Every structure is written in structure tokens, then in C-alpha cells.
């Protein structure tokens, strides 16, 4: 109902630019610099391949064999179907054609049943071809004996009478640093166990590595390859080189029991490996996706990046190796790689492959009956995208990565489910920096970089979002976006057939990052008319912010863009933003105007640069430190050019340059100490006390924080908690018949203010006093616990003077305003903590004996003093909304804003006069009256407790409190003569009908609103100076009948009414 | 020169 007038919802100074404990980020400090770990530059190439084939045909080595069925198919050929020399040719050809499909642009060399010297040359030659590039050595010892414990491969002599051993040391001497080996022989570990012992131990911090020597062995030390006819001899090679063919042929014999499904249809599968819209290519695609996923969840960032991203062939071999892991296992063989890798067999994900290969192979019978192209695409991708969704909703933390992530990647490659994958990816990127780091670890970057070439307007809104998130984390993608012409993508999105300025802010932000200190990005965006595009929209606050930050970064340190800025009238379109309500907008405008910069002469630029610096000097005295900081950096920039002019101006002070010097010295004494040190930097650049000395802007770096971040119920609980206490105790104050004062004080607290207490303030919702010295020290005393809670120095400047203490946002987390006699205002968070009290904002109100009052309702701060005007500040905007002429011709001594009626204000004057204002009116002065007729200053005043514009007001120093309501009559309601002269303080309650006055004799008289003397208190001195003559602090508790009083001695005493 | 083939 009506008492909602007492209880405002206007919160103020609780935005992200006023941030609290962990971050002093909110300007001043530079942005958080990044150090990435996803940087393997070298796309590595396996440029040469050496195939070696030791299979003496129908000459089994004397190691085991025995089996009557025994397997001997190789490269999918029966070697007993062509006679030795042509069989061994065909196997050599097929096997290279097999490998060649994985790396078609390497060079391939085959050698069949070779001598040691032939192999010496093979390997020596493969070095010379691919110098830095990797070499692949494939060895097949099926017709020779098993590798040794001495570390040996077996090869032949010319006449084939002997098996000649070939030391691993010699192979490793012929091939060198970048190389990879495949061994499809029996006891193959044996080779790797030799390799590990070749070189001295050291040169790494992994298991037992050093070089770039990669090894793929077919089975263990004690193991022999399978002889069963269900497998070939070629199992490991066939897994690594023909994975699909093997995976299905295996799936037939094992799982389904083979006899329903003709196994030779696997040779005749329709389509090619390329076409994802054919049954072969799509099955190949599912396999890639399945296997790539098993690797990513099983392996760590680094090892995954080395084996599965770096080298296209190594990627494929180690991918296909995970199939060997599984198949070989079923045939009593346990293959190993040198970078060892954890167990991957029977990972959940092989189940999803098995499902899809069963759904494929049942379809295969009918597709041969006729090429019908009734090829039903597999649900697999849809199914896994849904499992990623499930993860994103339920379990949306860092509770171990999503697993479906490398499948989301594969889906981006075809249009089939691209939009939803991109949607789910963005949704995933949105959860934070950690999730971007994960996306870029999978290898999403270049695929999402390619999609900036897609014209499809469906994808554009999601692609901007994805790129925002990436560039919010990693600024360095700058280089790659410009080199591929991705910058044009976002400029078109700024022109926009589409709508939504939240999306266009992103687009402006993305371009700001692309450009930021990137002279090729500046140049590329300048050629695309980004100035013109941006300036077009300058004819929502976030969008205006980023339109400026984009232009700012584009101008910066680039005379060609600056010239385009002037002649496109950037100044004339930017300047009106300098007076926008949001400090974020103003500060950004200042940054942009700032980066356009860099006797009697006029050319084009001097007009612009004079007009720019004039407009920036106009916002020197701004309410928000955010803006002032930017103005100070832009002044430093301007100062850097015109040092000679500005030195001569500093001589005479101690046309436009004289204004500049005032602004430096004004900034040098600013109430925000970071702004103050900024101004002191500018002074030292001028030489009042190499481009590296210039201070650097922060608005851009702060604002980026928005995007590097996702895109309540306790807050409202403690809000309503206090509202209950307020409304209940309001009624109590009013309706309780307030009996006499209890003269026995509850406290007589020694502040140790040597000079004494000058003001104080009671807290509404807790047992706290705040008191202040004449030199603006602040103590936060507790009157229920009898304990100190904090100690300050409000500012470190030598010229002191306390003027006022107020509470802003009483209803949720109070901030302590501390106004000073020079007009500066400082508002403090966490003032009740032991010593963790940050300065939220400081601005100089009044541009003296300043007098200040805060109107929580309207968000207005009123300030004035020995000035002709009452200055009006709007702390939601942090602007000087209005300068109201007092129309007095003497000083404002006291100043009370109405807590009920926003805009309305009472003002006590030095001559004893008294004025109402309605600051929300074309004529602000409502009425002007004397009351109390001695010509002495109005030491205090206030609006009468209630919902009317009446006024307890006008305690004059002459001694007389005068009551008057200015609706009906000028003359006084009621006079009370508290003191014979020397009235030094007044205290008027917010709700209870009660007042108290203070005397510069010794004395405190409490009165009813009607006039009854409810109490007298005499503040007695402690030694005999007889100086209790600044009984200055007198203040009632907002919601309780509790007085607080302090003098020109040292004791802040509290009293109550029984 | 991408690892997996894209269809733009």
C-alpha cells in the first residue's frame, strides 16, 4: 500500500562495473592474459613408405606352424593361387595400394624377400626423399623366424638358403628422428623392447621415450599370430590398412555365426569410401567417428594431439590400431604401440559400431538384388547427438568431458545434421572457457573456420555465436580468420538481412578482436568498409558499446583508418554517445575518439583533433571512474603529441592547451586513487614530476569479459526480510507513545578522535554505528557487542574535511557514502568487515563547505555548499543530470532530500533563509521563506516524519527550531527555543514523532514533535578545556527510538527511551 | 588441407 513510498526498489552501484572481492578488474587493471596449450603447429607429413615382405612361399619357417587348415591369405590374396614369384608381386602391389588409400601423396617402395643390404638401401633412400618428413617402415616376417631377445629382425640371403638376422640398431641408424614402424610378425614386442634399449635413458618425462620414434607391433613377446582360417595371416596389417573389410568379415564369423549373411557381399559393398551418402562411405564415416571418439576419451590432450591430429596417416593407423586391439585380442594376441595407449577394447562405443555394422549388413542382401538406392542413412549420428544433449542438460558441470564431442565434430562435415550439431556445440561452448578449450582440443577450429564460407543464412546466427565464444577465450585466432577472409563473414552480419542487436554486438565484438593490434586485420577490415558499416548503425547500449570499441581498435595507431574516420564524420556520430546514460557507452566512445588522435596552422586534422580533445575534456569531470580513466588515457595520447605546447601552458598556469593542463591537475587530485595516479602519469609525460610510458586503455579488455561468460532467490529473501522489519518498526515508531529519554547512556565510547567526533550514522538493520573524525577517518563501532568492526582513512590527501555519511541500498547490502567538504564523494563496499573495504566509486560533486544528501528513491544525490547552485547527480547513470540555481546569493548550510517524495528537496541557508525545490520541474524553486528571524545560518533541517511535504527543519544557530508546513502557510506551525544561541546540531527522526538538538555549550535537549521536552543530556568534559562546543553528531536510528551523540572531546555516546 | 573432409 502507501508505505511502499518508504521502501524503494531502486538499487544503485551494484553493476558489473562496480565489481567486488576477487576482481578489481572493473577498469584500472589490464585484461587477463592467456597462455594456450593447444599449439602443435606442424601438420606433419609421412612423405615416404618402405614396404618389406619376408614371406618365403611354401617354405614355412621352423618355429611352429603345425595346423592343417592354417591361415595364409595376405593382402587379401591366396598366395597358393599364383605360384611364388607372381603371388609375391601381387601381394606387394595390393598392400601398397592398401596403404596408399590412407596417404596417397607419399612415395611407396616395396621390397620382396630382401637381403640385409637391400633393406639398408631401402631405408637409406627413404631418408633422402623425406628429410624432415616422416618415414613409414612396414615389416612382415611370416615366412622368416621370430624376432629375437637380442633385438633382431630376420631377412634373407640371396640364394634363400639362410635366414639372416638384421639388428634393430641398424634399422634405427638408417631411418632417423621422424619415423614410424609397423611389425606384422609373431613375437613383435621383442622388437619394441629392443627399440627402448637402443638409446640412453633420459631426454623425456613420460614412460620410457625420447625420440620421435613410433612403433606398432602385432602381438606380445610370448605370442604367435593366429593360424585359424577365420583370420588371414595378414590380420594386423589388414586391420591397420583395410579396417572396414576386416571389421565386417570378423563380425560375420564371430557374432551372427556367418551362415545367414553371405560373407562375399562384404567385397561387393556398394559406394565408395568418400561418399557419406553411399553405404560404404557412410560405414567408413561411422568407423572413423567411432574410433576417433574412443581415442579422445581414453587418451590425454597431448598424446591424442600427437597420434590422432598431427599426421593424417599416423592418425589413420592409430585409429585403425584400435580395431587391431579388439580383433587380435579374440585370437590370443595383444598388440602394443610405443606410445603405449590405455586399453580401448570393450569400450562402450564399439557397441554403437556393432549396432551400425549389423544394421548395414542386413541391408546389404537387398541392395545387391537391385541397385535400388534405398540406402537408409544410419541413425548413429542422430543417436549420439541426442546423448550429447542429455549431457548438456543433466550433468552440465566439469564432471568429466561429454564423450560425444569428437562425434559432434564429424557431424559438421556433412549438411545432414550440421545445424543441430552447431547448435549443440554452441550450447556447449556457452558453459565457459573450459568447454571452448575442450572443443579446440578435439580439433573443431579449422572446420568451424571453413563454415565461414557457407552462404546458408540458417547457419549464420549460430556461427557468429560459436566464434564469439572462441575469440572470447583465444584472441590469437585473429590471424587465421583474416588469412581465410572470415572477417568478411561478420561484416555482412553487421549489414544484416537478419535482425537482433544482441547478435550484432557479437559481430562487432568478433571484428574488434580480429582487428585488435592486427595491422593486416585493420587493413582487411578497412578495405571492407567496416568504418562505413559501423557508422551507419550510429544514426541498444551493448551494441553502441561494441560499435565504438570496433571503430576504436580499427583507427588505433593506423593513420590510414584515422583519415577515413575524419572524412566519414566519425567524430560527429561518436560525440553524442559521450552523453549516453550508460558509463560503458560513454567510456567506449571516449576510447574511440581517443584512438582517432596521432604556432597557428589549420589542416583537416587539426580541426578534428581540437574538436575531439574539446569533447573529451568535457567528460573529464564525469560521475563514473570508468569514463574518467578512458579520458585520462586519451589525454595521455594527446599529451604525447603536443608536449611542447603543453609544457608552455604549464609554465603560465603555475587556447585549447590551457584547458588540457587544468584537466591533468584535476585528474591528479581525483577522489578515485587509480584515476588520480592516471592523472599523475599524464603529468609526467608532459614533464611535471619511450611510448611505453603511455598508460593503456582498459574499457575494451573489461567489456570482452561479457562474452567470455555464459549467455536470485537468496537476494529477494534478505530483501523481504528487512522490508518486514522496516514496515513493522515504521508503524511502531509512529504509534508508540514515546515516553521520556533514559539519561543513563548505553555507551560512552572513546573513538580516540583527538580532536573529536564530527559526524555519525546508525545502521537500520544491525547494531552498528559509523563515526567520522575531522580528518575523515572512519570507525565502525558495534553497540551490541561493544567491539570495533573496521578502521579507515577515507582518502590519503593532506587537505581533509568530513561533510556527510549516508547509506545507499539499505535494503540489500549497504554501501557507505562519505562526502567531504571539498565536494568529493566516496562510496565504500564491505565497510563493516575487519579490513576488506573496497572503494566502489568516487566522483567530485560540485564543479566551499560542501553539503550533501542522498535520495535512495530517485537515485539522486544532491550536493551544494558555498556555491550559487544545487548540483544534481543521478547515480544510476553516474552523470551530472542538472545544475539548479539556488537563487539565494549566500551559501547552502544544510540540505535534506525527501525520502518519500523523489525530486523534492529542502535547503537551509547561511542567512537563515529556507527553500523548497522540486528538481523535476522547469522552475525548480518551489518556495522561499525566512522562518526564525535571527540572521544566522541554518545548522540543520529535515522533512517531518510522514507522507506530507511539511518540515521540522530550521534549527538555526540562534537556538530556535521552527516547525512549518509549506502547503498552507509560510509562518511557523510551532516554535521551540532549544538553546540560547550556539545551536550546533539537529536530529530529526525518520518515522517517530521526535527530534533532538545540540548546543555548543554542553547540552542535548530531546523534544516531541509537538514541543514537549522529552529529555536533557549534559555532555560533561573529561579535562578542563571546557570545549564541548562541537556537539556535532546527533542522529536517530531509522527504525528505532535510539539517539547517538558526540562532541569536541572524544566520546560517541548512545541513549534510548526506556 | 584438412584431416577430415568437409562438404561446404
UniProtKB/Swiss-Prot annotation, chain A:
It is found in: Cytoplasm. One of its GO terms (molecular function) is kinase binding. WD repeats lie at residues 752-791, 797-838, 848-883, 887-927, 933-974, 978-1017, 1026-1058. SUPFAM superfamilies: ARM repeat (SSF48371), WD40 repeat-like (SSF50978). Keywords: Cytoplasm, Developmental protein, Growth regulation, Repeat, WD repeat. The keyword Membrane does not apply. GO terms for biological process: embryo development ending in seed dormancy; maintenance of shoot apical meristem identity; negative regulation of autophagy; TOR signaling. The keyword Cell membrane does not apply. Disruption phenotype: Embryonic lethality when homozygous. Embryo development arrested at very early stage (early pre-globular stage), leading to aborted shrunken seeds. Constitutive autophagy. Expressed in roots, leaves, flowers and seeds. Its main location: cytoplasm. GO terms for cellular component: Cul4-RING E3 ubiquitin ligase complex; cytoplasm; TORC1 complex. It comes from the Eukaryota. Phosphorylated by KIN10. Interacts with TOR, ATPK1 and ML1. Interacts with KIN10. This is Regulatory-associated protein of TOR 1. The lineage of its organism: Eukaryota, Viridiplantae, Streptophyta, Embryophyta, Tracheophyta.
Swiss-Prot record, chain B:
A motif (TOS motif) lies at residues 4-8. Disulfide bonds: none annotated. It comes from the Eukaryota. It is found in: Cytoplasm; Nucleus. Phosphorylated on serine and threonine residues in response to insulin, EGF and PDGF. Ubiquitinated: when eIF4E levels are low, hypophosphorylated form is ubiquitinated by the BCR(KLHL25) complex, leading to its degradation and serving as a homeostatic mechanism to maintain translation and prevent eIF4E inhibition when eIF4E levels are low. The modification Phosphoserine is found at residue 2. Hypophosphorylated EIF4EBP1 competes with EIF4G1/EIF4G3 to interact with EIF4E; insulin stimulated MAP-kinase (MAPK1 and MAPK3) or mTORC1 phosphorylation of EIF4EBP1 causes dissociation of the complex allowing EIF4G1/EIF4G3 to bind and consequent initiation of translation. Interacts (via TOS motif) with RPTOR; promoting phosphorylation by mTORC1. The TOS motif mediates interaction with RPTOR, leading to promote phosphorylation by mTORC1 complex. Belongs to the eIF4E-binding protein family. Repressor of translation initiation that regulates EIF4E activity by preventing its assembly into the eIF4F complex: hypophosphorylated form competes with EIF4G1/EIF4G3 and strongly binds to EIF4E, leading to repress translation. In contrast, hyperphosphorylated form dissociates from EIF4E, allowing interaction between EIF4G1/EIF4G3 and EIF4E, leading to initiation of translation. Mediates the regulation of protein translation by hormones, growth factors and other stimuli that signal through the MAP kinase and mTORC1 pathways. This is Eukaryotic translation initiation factor 4E-binding protein 1. It comes from Homo sapiens. The lineage of its organism: Eukaryota, Metazoa, Chordata, Craniata, Vertebrata.
Amino acid at each position: 500500500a502507501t508505505s511502499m513510498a518508504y521502501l524503494p526498489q531502486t538499487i544503485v552501484l551494484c553493476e558489473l562495473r562496480h565489481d567486488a572481492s576477487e576482481a578489481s578488474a572493473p577498469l584500472g587493471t589490464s585484461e587477463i592474459v592467456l597462455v594456450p596449450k593447444w599449439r602443435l603447429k606442424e601438420r606433419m607429413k609421412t612423405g615416404c613408405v618402405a614396404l618389406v615382405l619376408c614371406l618365403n612361399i611354401t617354405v614355412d619357417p621352423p618355429d611352429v606352424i603345425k595346423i592343417s587348415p592354417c591361415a595364409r591369405i595376405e593382402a587379401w590374396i591366396d598366395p597358393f593361387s599364383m605360384a611364388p614369384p607372381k603371388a609375391l608381386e601381387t601381394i606387394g602391389k595390393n598392400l601398397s595400394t592398401q596403404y596408399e588409400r590412407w596417404q596417397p601423396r607419399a612415395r611407396y617402395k616395396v621390397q620382396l624377400d630382401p637381403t640385409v643390404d637391400e633393406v639398408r638401401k631401402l631405408c637409406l633412400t627413404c631418408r633422402k626423399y623425406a628429410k624432415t618428413e616422416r618415414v613409414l617402415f612396414h615389416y612382415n616376417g611370416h615366412g622368416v623366424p621370430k624376432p629375437t631377445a637380442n633385438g633382431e629382425i630376420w631377412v634373407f640371403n640371396k640364394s634363400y638358403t639362410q635366414y639372416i638376422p638384421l639388428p634393430i640398431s641398424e634399422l634405427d641408424s638408417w631411418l632417423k628422428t621422424p619415423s614410424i614402424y609397423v611389425f606384422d610378425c609373431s613375437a613383435a614386442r621383442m622388437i619394441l623392447n629392443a627399440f627402448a634399449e637402443l638409446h640412453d635413458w633420459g631426454s623425456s618425462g613420460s614412460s620410457g621415450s625420447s625420440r620421435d620414434c613410433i612403433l606398432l607391433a602385432a602381438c606380445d613377446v610370448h605370442e604367435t599370430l593366429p593360424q585359424s582360417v577365420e583370420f588371414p595371416a595378414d590380420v594386423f596389417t589388414s586391420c591397420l590398412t583395410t579396417p572396414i573389410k576386416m571389421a565386417l568379415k570378423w563380425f560375420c564369423r564371430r557374432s551372427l555365426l556367418k551362415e545367414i549373411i553371405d560373407e562375399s557381399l562384404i567385397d561387393r559393398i556398394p559406394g565408395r569410401q568418400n561418399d557419406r551418402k553411399t553405404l560404404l562411405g557412410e560405414l567408413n564415416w561411422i568407423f572413423t567417428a567411432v574410433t576417433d571418439t574412443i581415442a579422445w576419451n581414453v587418451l590425454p590432450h597431448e598424446l591424442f594431439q600427437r597420434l590422432f591430429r598431427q599426421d593424417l596417416l599416423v592418425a589413420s593407423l592409430f585409429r585403425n590400431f584400435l580395431l587391431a586391439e579388439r580383433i587380435m585380442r579374440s585370437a590370443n594376441c595383444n598388440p602394443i604401440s610405443h606410445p603405449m595407449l590405455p586399453p580401448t577394447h570393450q569400450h562402450h562405443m564399439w557397441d554403437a559400431w556393432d549396432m551400425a555394422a549389423e544394421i548395414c549388413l542386413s541391408q546389404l542382401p537387398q541392395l545387391v538384388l537391385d541397385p535400388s538406392t534405398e540406402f537408409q542413412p544410419s541413425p548413429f549420428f542422430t543417436e549420439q547427438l541426442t546423448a550429447f544433449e542429455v549431457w548438456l542438460d543433466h550433468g552440465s558441470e566439469h564432471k568429466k568431458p561429454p564423450e560425444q564431442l569428437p562425434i559432434v565434430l564429424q557431424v559438421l562435415l556433412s549438411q545432414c545434421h550440421r545445424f543441430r550439431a552447431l547448435v549443440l556445440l554452441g550450447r556447449f561452448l556457452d558453459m565457459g572457457s573450459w568447454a571452448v578449450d575442450l572443443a579446440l582440443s578435439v580439433g573443431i577450429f579449422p572446420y568451424v573456420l571453413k563454415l565461414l564460407q557457407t552462404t546458408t543464412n540458417e547457419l549464420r546466427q549460430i556461427l557468429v555465436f560459436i566464434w564469439t565464444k572462441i575469440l572470447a577465450l583465444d584472441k590469437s585466432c585473429q590471424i587465421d580468420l583474416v588469412k581465410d577472409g572470415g572477417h568478411t563473414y561478420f561484416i555482412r552480419f553487421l549489414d544484416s538481412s537478419g535482425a537482433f542487436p544482441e547478435q550484432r554486438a557479437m559481430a562487432a565484438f568478433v571484428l574488434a578482436v580480429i582487428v585488435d593490434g592486427h595491422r593486416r586485420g585493420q587493413e582487411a577490415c578497412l578495405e571492407a568498409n567496416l568504418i562505413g558499416v559501423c557508422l551507419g548503425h550510429l544514426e541498444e547500449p551493448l551494441f553502441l558499446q561494441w560499435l565504438c570499441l570496433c571503430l576504436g581498435k580499427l583507427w588505433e595507431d593506423f593513420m590510414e583508418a584515422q583519415i577515413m574516420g575524419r572524412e566519414a564524420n566519425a567524430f560527429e556520430k561518436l560525440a553524442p554517445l559521450l552523453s549516453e546514460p550508460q558509463p560503458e557507452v560513454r567510456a567506449a566512445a571516449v576510447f574511440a575518439l581517443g584512438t582517432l588522435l596521432d604556432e597557428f596552422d589549420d589542416d583537416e586534422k587539426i580541426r578534428a583533433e581540437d574538436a575531439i580533445i574539446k569533447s573529451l575534456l568535457d567528460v573529464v569531470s564525469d560521475g563514473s571512474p570508468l569514463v574518467r580513466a578512458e579520458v585520462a588515457v586519451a589525454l595521455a595520447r594527446f599529451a604525447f603529441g603536443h608536449k611542447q605546447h603543453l609544457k608552455l601552458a604549464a609554465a603560465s598556469y603555475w587556447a585549447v592547451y590551457s584547458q588540457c593542463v587544468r584537466a591533468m591537475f584535476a585528474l591528479a587530485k581525483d577522489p578515485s586513487p587509480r584515476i588520480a595516479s592516471l592523472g599523475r602519469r599524464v603529468l609526467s609525460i608532459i614533464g611535471i614530476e619511450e611510448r611505453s610510458l603511455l598508460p593503456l586503455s582498459t574499457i575494451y579488455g573489461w567489456s570482452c569479459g561479457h562474452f567470455s561468460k555464459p549467455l536470485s532467490q537468496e537476494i529477494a529473501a534478505k530483501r523481504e526480510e528487512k522490508e518486514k522489519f522496516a514496515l513493522e518498526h515504521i508503524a511502531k515508531c509512529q504509534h508508540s507513545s514515546i515516553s521520556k529519554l533514559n539519561n543513563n547512556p548505553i555507551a560512552n565510547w572513546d573513538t580516540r578522535f583527538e580532536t573529536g567526533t564530527k559526524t555519525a550514522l546508525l545502521h537500520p538493520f544491525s547494531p552498528i554505528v559509523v563515526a567520522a573524525d575531522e580528518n575523515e577517518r572512519i570507525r565502525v563501532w558495534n553497540y551490541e557487542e561493544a567491539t570495533l568492526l573496521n578502521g579507515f582513512d577515507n582518502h590519503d590527501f593532506p587537505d581533509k574535511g568530513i561533510s556527510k555519511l549516508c547509506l545507499i541500498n539499505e535494503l540489500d547490502d549497504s554501501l557507505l557514502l562519505v562526502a567531504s567538504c571539498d565536494g568529493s564523494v566516496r562510496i565504500w563496499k564491505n565497510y563493516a568487515t575487519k579490513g576488506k573495504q573496497k572503494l566502489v566509486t568516487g566522483f567530485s560533486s560540485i564543479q566551499l563547505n560542501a553539503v550533501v544528501d542522498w535520495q535512495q528513491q530517485s537515485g539522486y544525490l544532491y550536493a551544494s555548499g558555498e556555491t550559487s547552485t544545487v548540483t544534481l547527480w543521478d547515480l544510476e547513470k553516474e552523470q551530472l543530470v542538472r545544475s539548479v540555481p539556488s537563487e539565494s546569493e549566500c551559501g547552502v548550510t544544510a540540505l535534506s532530500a525527501s525520502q518519500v517524495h523523489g525530486g523534492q528537496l529542502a535547503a537551509g541557508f547561511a542567512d537563515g533563509s529556507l527553500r523548497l525545490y522540486d528538481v523535476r520541474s522547469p522552475e525548480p524553486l518551489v518556495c522561499a521563506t525566512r522562518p526564525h528571524q535571527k540572521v544566522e545560518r541554518v545548522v540543520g533541517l529535515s522533512f517531518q516524519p510522514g507522507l506530507d511535504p511539511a518540515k521540522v527543519v530550521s534549527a538555526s544557530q540562534a537556538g530556535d527550531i521552527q516547525f512549518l508546513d509549506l502547503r498552507t502557510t509560510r509562518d511557523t506551525y510551532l516554535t521551540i527555543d532549544a538553546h540560547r544561541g550556539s545551536l550546533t546540531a539537529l536530529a530529526v527522526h525518520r518515522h517517530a514523532p521526535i527530534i533532538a538538538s545540540g548546543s555548543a555549550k554542553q547540552l542535548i535537549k530531546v523534544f516531541s514533535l509537538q514541543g514537549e521536552q522529552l529529555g536533557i543530556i549534559r555532555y560533561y568534559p573529561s579535562f578542563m578545556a571546557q570545549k564541548i562546543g562541537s556537539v556535532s553528531c546527533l542522529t536517530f536510528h531509522p527504525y528505532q527510538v535510539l539517539l547517538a551523540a558526540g562532541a569536541a572531546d572524544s566520546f560517541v555516546s548512545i541513549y534510548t527511551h526506556d | 588441407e584438412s584431416q577430415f573432409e568437409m562438404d561446404i
